[PDB]
């Protein structure tokens, strides 16, 4: 509930600055807006790929840290350590 709320807020932010910055460089906007162009399932998948150190995800570090902490608390609760 709160993780997705923060994710939606940060994706609101990023898109707002991309839209206010599209004028200064129109060419980059075509590649930059594929995230918002993608279907919502693909958007979630690509925005949730920050696992490991590949880090291609356009996700803020705090939002990454929240999920990286919940995912280790869950493993401790599931006895996977």
């Amino acid at each position: 509930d709160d993780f997705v709320a923060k994710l939606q807020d940060n994706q609101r932010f990023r898109y707002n600055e991309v839209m206010q910055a599209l004028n200064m460089s129109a060419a980059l906007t075509a590649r930059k807006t594929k995230e918002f162009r993608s279907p919502p399932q693909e958007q979630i998948n690509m925005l949730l790929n920050f696992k490991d150190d590949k880090s291609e995800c356009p996700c803020p570090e705090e939002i990454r840290d929240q999920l990286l902490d919940f995912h280790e608390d869950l493993m401790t609760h599931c006895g996977i350590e």
Partner: peptide
């Protein structure tokens, strides 16, 4: 082009759908 860019907004998606 704004409409085609804005199709499928995961921030305009309702909370439960996003969850």
């Amino acid at each position: 082009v704004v409409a085609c860019f804005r199709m499928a907004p995961l921030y305009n998606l309702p909370r439960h759908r996003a969850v």
